[PDB]
Swiss-Prot record, chain B:
Family of this protein: Belongs to the bacterial ribosomal protein bS18 family.
Transmembrane spans: none
GO terms, molecular function: small ribosomal subunit rRNA binding; structural constituent of ribosome
GO cellular component, one term: cytosolic small ribosomal subunit
Coiled-coil intervals, chain numbering: none
Oligomeric and partner information: Part of the 30S ribosomal subunit. Forms a tight heterodimer with protein bS6.
Protein name per Swiss-Prot or TrEMBL: Small ribosomal subunit protein bS18B
Described purpose of this protein according to its UniProt entry: Binds as a heterodimer with protein bS6 to the central domain of the 16S rRNA, where it helps stabilize the platform of the 30S subunit.
Chain's gene name: rpsR2
Nuclease recorded as keyword: no
Source organism superkingdom: Bacteria
Biological process terms in GO annotation: translation
Full protein stretch here: 17 to 81 of 84
Swiss-Prot record, chain D:
Protein name per the record: Small ribosomal subunit protein uS2
Family to which the UniProt record says this protein belongs: Belongs to the universal ribosomal protein uS2 family.
Entry keywords, A to Z: Ribonucleoprotein, Ribosomal protein
A GO BP annotation: translation
GO molecular function: structural constituent of ribosome
Species assigned in the record: Mycolicibacterium smegmatis (strain ATCC 700084 / mc(2)155)
Residues of the full protein shown: 1 to 228 of 277
Domain of life: Bacteria
Keyword Nuclease: no
Gene: rpsB
Keyword Oxidoreductase belongs to the record: no
From Swiss-Prot, chain F:
Matches recorded under PANTHER family: 40S RIBOSOMAL PROTEIN S15A
Domain of life: Bacteria
GO cellular component, one term: ribosome
HAMAP family: Ribosomal_uS8_B
Protein name: Small ribosomal subunit protein uS8
GO biological process, one term: translation
Summary of subunit composition and partner proteins: Part of the 30S ribosomal subunit. Contacts proteins S5 and S12.
InterPro entries: Ribosomal_uS8, Ribosomal_uS8_CS, Ribosomal_uS8_sf
Role description: One of the primary rRNA binding proteins, it binds directly to 16S rRNA central domain where it helps coordinate assembly of the platform of the 30S subunit.
NCBIfam families the record matches: PRK00136.1
From Swiss-Prot, chain G:
Lineage top rank: taxon: Bacteria
Source organism per UniProt: Mycolicibacterium smegmatis (strain ATCC 700084 / mc(2)155) (Mycobacterium smegmatis)
Entry comment, domain topic: Full-length S1 protein and the C-terminal domain (residues 285-479) bind tmRNA, the interaction is not disrupted by POA. Unlike M.tuberculosis (strain H37Rv) the S1 motif 4 does not bind POA, which may explain why M.smegmatis is resistant to the antibiotic PZA, the precursor to POA.
Residues shown, of full length: 18 to 186 of 479
Summary of subunit composition and partner proteins: Binds uncharacterized protein MSMEG_2731/MSMEI_2664.
Function: Binds mRNA, facilitating recognition of most mRNAs by the 30S ribosomal subunit during translation initiation. Plays a role in trans-translation; binds tmRNA (the product of the ssrA gene). Binds very poorly to pyrazinoic acid (POA), the active form of the prodrug pyrazinamide (PZA); POA does not disrupt trans-translation in this organism. M.smegmatis is resistant to the antibiotic PZA.
Domain S1 motif, residue spans: 19-88, 104-154
Name of the protein in question: Small ribosomal subunit protein bS1
Protein family membership: Belongs to the bacterial ribosomal protein bS1 family.
Amino acid sequence: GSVIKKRRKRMSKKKHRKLLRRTRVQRRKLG
Amino acid sequence: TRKCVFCSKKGQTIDYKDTALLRTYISERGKIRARRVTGNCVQHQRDIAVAVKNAREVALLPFGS
Amino acid sequence: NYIERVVSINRVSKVVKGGRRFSFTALVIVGDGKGMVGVGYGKAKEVPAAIAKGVEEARKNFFRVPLIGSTITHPVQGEAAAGVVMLRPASPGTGVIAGGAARAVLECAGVHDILAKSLGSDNAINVVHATVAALKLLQRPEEVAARRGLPIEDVAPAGMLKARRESE
Amino acid sequence: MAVVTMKQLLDSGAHFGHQTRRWNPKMKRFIFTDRNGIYIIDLQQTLTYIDKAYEFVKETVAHGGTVLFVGTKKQAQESIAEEATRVGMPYVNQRWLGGMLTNFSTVHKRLQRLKELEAMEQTGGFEGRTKKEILMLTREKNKLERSLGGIRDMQKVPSAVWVVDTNKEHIAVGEARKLGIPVIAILDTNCDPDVVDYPIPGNDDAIRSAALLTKVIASAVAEGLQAR
Amino acid sequence: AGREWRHESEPARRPGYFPRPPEERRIIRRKSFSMVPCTVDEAALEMEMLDYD
Amino acid sequence: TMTDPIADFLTRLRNANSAYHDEVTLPHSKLKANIAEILKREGYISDYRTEDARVGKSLVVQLKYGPSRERSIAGLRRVSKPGLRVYAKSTNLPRVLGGLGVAIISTSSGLLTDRQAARQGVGGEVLAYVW
Amino acid sequence: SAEDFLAAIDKTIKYFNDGDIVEGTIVKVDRDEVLLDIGYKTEGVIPSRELSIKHDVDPNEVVSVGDEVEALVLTKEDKEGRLILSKKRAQYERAWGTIEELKVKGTVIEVVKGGLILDIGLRGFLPASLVYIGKEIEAKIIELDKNRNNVVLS
Amino acid sequence: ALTAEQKKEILGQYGLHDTDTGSPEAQVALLTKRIQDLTEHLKVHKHDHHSRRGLLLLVGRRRRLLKYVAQVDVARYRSLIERLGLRR
RNA sequence: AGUAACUGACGCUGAGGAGCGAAAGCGUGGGGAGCGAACAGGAUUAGAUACCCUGGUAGUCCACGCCGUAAACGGUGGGUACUAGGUGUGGGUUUCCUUCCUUGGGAUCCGUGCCGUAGCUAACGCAUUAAGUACCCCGCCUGGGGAGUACGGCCGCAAGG
RNA sequence: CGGCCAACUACGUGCCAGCAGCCGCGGUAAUACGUAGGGUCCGAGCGUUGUCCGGAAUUACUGGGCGUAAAGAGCUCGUA
C-alpha cells in the first residue's frame, strides 16, 4: 500500500515520543 | 562442461599434505579457483577449499604470493 | 417483435492534452419475452449511437433461458466479477421480484414469476453479468435425465412434471 | 475408405512430432512412443480420423459448400497453393490478415478494389496521370494480389476451413471457432486438440507429410465436387 | 564510478579489443610472417601494405 | 491429518471430474463403497469396483461423461461434517436443485436418497449433496 | 505384428549428433535460406551466410532445387525445432583435412602488394618474394593454425 | 546420541521381549537416558539453547508416550514410573 | 534415504502458559585497532542545529545478567488428500544405454528456483512450494481520525513494553 | 413537484434572504429560496420529531473475510 498511512502513523508516534521526553521528569515526580 | 576428476572411479583423495594436487587448483596469485572454472561437485569443491586452507595454515602454500 | 431495456447510460472520459474527451456507454438488454435474451455494451460519442451499438451487440449474442412454464427450473446462484445474484423459482402470479438490472434482464428473457436478489457489487454491468451467469447455470429436466440416463419421472419431482403438463 | 495406405503417409514422416520438452500433455491420447527426445504418433488413430475427415469433406462440398486451404508456414506453402489451383478453391499461403472471416464485409472491398485495378490495367491508364501515381498504383496492385491470391473466389463465407500447423495460424483457428466454422486440421504433438473439431494427427514440419495430407484433402474435395 | 547512470554520466572507456577477461584469455594467434633480413625502408613497405601498426 | 474421509472422497471425485479424468482410485471403506453404489444407482458415476492394494483394499470409480465430453456431475458438497453435524427429521428432509439433485441421508435403515427417506418416513444424517 | 512392423519402421530412422556430417537433398531454395531434406522430423536449414565461402553469393545460383549436399550440424535444437546445417563449415572441415593432407594447390582471392592470399577454400599467405589476380600456383605450407583454419603457404 | 551398545543394553533390560525396540517402555527408557545425558551436557554449556530445544522436544515425546501407556494399562505405567525413577 | 525388524492410532491443533527472540538500549567488571550517535571546528547556503571535510565520546567487542521490540515480510498460521506439464539446482537410493570414464538416460523419495494449464482473484498476480478443490484446530478485522492514545492494571533498574 | 421519488412554468431576490435526508441549490435571466398558477400523492386527515426492525450479506448459523483494501500472533513447546 501507499506509504501515506505509514507517514501519518510515524508522525503520531514521533509526537507522542517527544511529549514523553518533555514530561518524563514531571511524570516521575507525580508518579 | 568440465569433469569432476574426483567423482570419477580414479578420483584421488583430497588431503592437505599432497601439495601439487592443491597447487593445480589455485590461481597464480594463490587464490582458490571458482567452482565453475574447475567443474568439480560442491562437496569436492568444499573439500578442496578446506584442504587449501589447512595447507596454508601449516605453511605449505603461500598466502597470496 | 422485440422489447428493449436500456439499463445504464454512463458518461466516461479520457484525458488528452487539450482536456477531457467524453464518450457515452450504453448497457442494453434485448429479448423477446419468450425465453431468449441477450446483453450488449456499446460505446460511442453520442447516446443514440451507443444505444444502437448495444442493441446490435445484444442481438448478436442471444441465449435461451430454460423456462418451465413461467419461471426458472430451480434455484441458482451466479457470480460474475464481484457481483452475486441469486435466483429462485416462484409460484405463478407472484410476478417479477428483482432489482433494476435483474428485473430488466428477467423481463426481457420472459420470466414472469421469480425471486431475484443481488448480494454484492451494486454496479450495473457486473450485476447483469452475474444474472446472465446464473441463468446460464440453469438445467432443463430432460437434459438432467439424459445426463443421468434415467426416466424423467425418476429424476424430477411430481410438482415440476405437473407444471410442465399444465404449461404445455 | 482411405485413399492412402498406412505405409504411404508413414514414409513421409507423419509419425514424427516435436521434442519431448515442447509437447502438449493433451496429446497423450494420440502418442504411441517417445524415442530419441521426440514423440511418435500412432498412425491407427490418424487413419480412423482421416477417413472421417474425408467423409465430412465429401458431405460438405457435396451439399453446395466450400472449404478454405489455410497454411502460412513455408513448409506447407506451395503445396496448398497448387492444390487449390487443381480444385479451384480459396486458399491463403503468404500471411493471414487478421480478420478475414470476422471482418468479411470490410475485406471484400479490397477484392473490389483489386478488380477495379485489373479493369484499369485492361483499359491501360498507366500514362494518363503522374508517374508517381501510376507507380504507387502498380505497387498497390502487386501488394493486394500477393496478399489476396485465393480470396477472389470468396463470395459469401467458407463452409469449412482446412488448417496446417494450428499453432502458427492461431488467429485463423480463433476466427473459425468464433464463427462456428468447423476446422479440419492436422494437429502436431504440441497443438491443442480441443480447438479442432476433426483432427488428423501427424507431422506438419515436414514438407512431404504436409504435401501428402493436402493430396488427401484435395482428392476428397474433388470427389465431392464431382458428386454435386 | 560505475553505480548509477545519468544523461551526462561519463561514457565507459572501451578498448578496441573484445574484453575476454584474464579468465580463459589464452594465446590463439601466432604469426611468423617473415624473418628474412630487411632494411628500414623495406620493413616500412612490408608494414604499409599489411596495414599493421 | 485426515479428518473426514467422506469429504476427501468427494473432493477426489470433484477434482477428477474437473480434470476430465476417467478413473479415480482411493482407499476403500464400507461407507465410501455404499455412497459409491448410491451414486452408481442414481446414474452419476459409470461403475465402481474394489481392487486389493499393498496394505488394504482400494476403490476405483469410473466417471461418466456424455458424448459431447461434458461432465455428468455438476456439483459435490459435504453437508454434515466433523464438528458441526447435520441431522434431519423425516418431514424436513433437504431438497437439492429444487429436487433435481440428490441428497444422501444415513438413516437407521441404511443409506438412502432424500426421496427414498421421505417415502419410507425416516430421517438421519445428511451426508452430502450431489447434482 | 503391426506393433512390431511399426517398431521396425521406427528403428529404421537414424540419429546424428552436434558436429557430424549429414548428407541430404535440397527441397527449397529461398532468397534468404536454403532448405535440406535429411529424412528426419524437420528439414535442415542452411543460412545464406553459412552457404559458401564468398560473401556475395546468392543461394539460387549456388544451390538449386533437387541438388544434394553434405552439411554439418551446428545446433540440433532451435526455438522452432529446426536444426541449423552449414556446408560452409562442412567444406571448411573437409578442405582443412585435405589441407594437412597436402602439407598444395589452389587459387587466389585478395591482392596484397606484400604477398598473395590464396583462396584454396581457406586463406593462405604466399610471400611475394618467392612466388597475379585469379591465378593458380603451387607451393608448400609453412604455418597452420587450425583454430581459425588460417595457414601460411610458401 | 547414544552409542549402539548403550541402546542394546537399555533395550535388553527394558524391552518386553528380545526383539522389540518401539515398545513404549523401550522408547521411554531410551528417551529418559538421552534426556539425562543432554541435561548433564547442558549443565556445562548453559547458553546452548538449540540443544535445549531438542531436549524440550524429547521431554514432550516422553510425556506423550507415558500418557499413552497410562491410558492403555495403568499397572504398566506404575511399573515403568517406579523403575525409571520418574515423578510425573 | 534404504531395510521395513519393532509398538499398534500412541495423530493434528492449541485458549491461557512457558521458552527462544535482529539491532538499538540498561547494570556490574574488562577491552578499546577501525568505524562512529552526541559534541567541536571547516565548507556550501539568504539561513545550515543536515547532506560534504578534519577530529571525536558513548557504542560496536568479551563475561554474566536485563529489555522483549523490527518492513521480526513470502506483508501468505499449523496438519492432511487430490488437481496438465516443461526446465535449472542440492541430498540419497536403484534399472537400462554402457564406454560403464560420462549432469549418459530412465525410475523414485526429500528440498530449493523459473516458466506455464485448469482453477481462483477487483486487478496485479498465485498456479503441485496455491492466493485451486475440501476437512480439523487456533489468531485476527468490522469506516477514517481521535489512538495503539488517556485512565486503571501487569512487567521493567530505566528507556519503555 | 433537481435525482433517489408521482408531479413545471411565471414573477420577486441575487453568495443576500434563505433551502436541505444525501448529493448539493442562492453571482439580475433559480423547474432546489419566497409567492402565484398548474400538477401529483394522500384524504378527516396530512407532515415533522423521538424510538425499534428492515434495506445492512454492515457480526455473515442460514449468510463475510485476512498477499497489496481492516485483518496470520516474531517463532516454537505444551495445559484445558
